[PDB]
A paper describes a structure:
Proteins that perform these functions include Vipp1/IM30 in photosynthetic plastids, PspA in bacteria, and ESCRT-III in eukaryotes. Here, using a combination of evolutionary and structural analyses, we show that these protein families are homologous and share a common ancient evolutionary origin that likely predates the last universal common ancestor. This homology is evident in cryo-electron microscopy structures of Vipp1 rings from the cyanobacterium Nostoc punctiforme presented over a range of symmetries. Rings have an inner lumen that is able to bind and deform membranes.
Reconstructions were also generated for the other six symmetries and complete ring models built. Rungs are maximally constricted at the top and bottom with internal lumen diameters of 14 nm and 15.7 nm, and widest at the ring equator between rungs 3 and 4 with an internal diameter of 17.5 nm. This unique asymmetric curvature is a feature of all Vipp1C11–C17 ring symmetries. The analysis of different ring symmetries, ranging from C11–C17, provides us with a view of the structural flexibility that enables Vipp1, PspA, and ESCRT-III family members to perform their functions. Furthermore, as each ring comprises between 5–7 rungs stacked together to build a dome-shaped architecture, these asymmetric structures provide us with a glimpse of the structural features that enable filament tilt in the context of an ESCRT-III-like polymer. Consistent with this, Interfaces 1 and 3 linking the top two rungs were poorly resolved in Vipp1C11–C17 rings, indicating a weak interaction once the limiting geometry is reached. When membrane was modeled into the Vipp1C11–C17 structures as a 4-nm bilayer, sequential constriction was observed with the membrane lumen reaching ∼3 nm within Vipp1C11.
Residue numbers in the entry:
A (entry chain DD): 156 to 219
B (entry chain B): 156 to 207
C (entry chain I): 105 to 155
D (entry chain B): 1 to 52
E (entry chain A): 26 to 155
F (entry chain H): 53 to 155
Write the structure that this text describes.
Amino acid sequence: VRGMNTSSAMSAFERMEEKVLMQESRAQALGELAGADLETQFAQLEGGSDVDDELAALKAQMLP
Amino acid sequence: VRGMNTSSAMSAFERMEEKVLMQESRAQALGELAGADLETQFAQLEGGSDVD
Amino acid sequence: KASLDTQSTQVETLKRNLIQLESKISEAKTKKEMLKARITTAKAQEQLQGM
Amino acid sequence: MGLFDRIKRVVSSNLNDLVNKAEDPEKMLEQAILEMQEDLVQLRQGVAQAIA
Amino acid sequence: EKMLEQAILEMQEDLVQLRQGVAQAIAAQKRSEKQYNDAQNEINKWQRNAQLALQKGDENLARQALERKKTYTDTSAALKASLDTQSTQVETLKRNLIQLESKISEAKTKKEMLKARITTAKAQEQLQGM
Amino acid sequence: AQKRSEKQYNDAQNEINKWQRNAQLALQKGDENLARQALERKKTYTDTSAALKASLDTQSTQVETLKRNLIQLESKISEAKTKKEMLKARITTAKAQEQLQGM
């Protein structure tokens, strides 16, 4: 209950936490860098820009 | 996505670019020199003069 | 439920990342054909230019 | 205080190598669940004797 | 950061030793209390015997009981004095453990701050190489 | 490291909120001693949180400099490439001059 150093439950939680924390932190940092880059930033805008013109075109296409 | 040094896609693009850039630059420079020479310059005029 | 929500968000992000990767590989295939054509022209031109 | 200085350097190098191999999430998780269940049974037996 | 890592492992084992030491002090206080409790119980029993002796009319038995009670009281007084001295020492030990708990958390925070400056220094070195 | 401190800080805040609820529950219960103990725990938690916050601020300044250095380095590598072209041309010119001397 106290949680001895040698206890299996206490040791397992600490080991699991260290592995989980490192993996999560590394992935997020790498992901942020990709997001930070300018190429990713206007690509989303381009996609957003592309769909609206297509939608207008689509309406014209579906009109007849 | 980030483009690691060891990644195959990043390495391939860099290697391809270096080979392509060198070949293109060398050919253009050599071509310019041939164009620069006087013999080539009036030859075109001669052809133009000859056809009319 | 709390664990599921956090996990689901991560999964969604991974799916989005895969789509971006798919766009990139397709572009690379097109590039190889273009690169080869450029290389061939340069090689032929260089030999001709020297002569 | 040479011993103390020596101990700190020796301990740090030794600890780092050991922890990396030791820190695997899948291996650690499997061992922990089995151990706690076994411990509970032992505890119950002791409790049963007291109850008896 | 390596020094900090070495220190973190070292501090944890030390805390366990301190807890064992604290338990012994706690046990000692309990042991004295048990002895003190036994003495009080014995004294109460002795008082009843003395009261019984008075009813019996045997003066000598009562006198002997009183002497025993006095000796018991002296022992109890000594035990009480020991407990008070022990308690002050015990409180300090308990306080130290509480202080240590605050300190280990602070050390973890310190490690993050220490790591960042060192990383920055390394980054500066890279610029010099360029 | 900044994220780790933030996670710890977040956990402390969550723990403090939970502790506050327990203290509120204790007041309803009428047990004064339990509430007092909770307050002491909260104070200790607050001190830890304060230490974490202080560490984060110091870390952030260091982190910003590191980020700034990377940005500066990116500008610098591009400049170096430009420098190489300029450096190459003068060296080539010097070599050409040497050839003239030989003639």
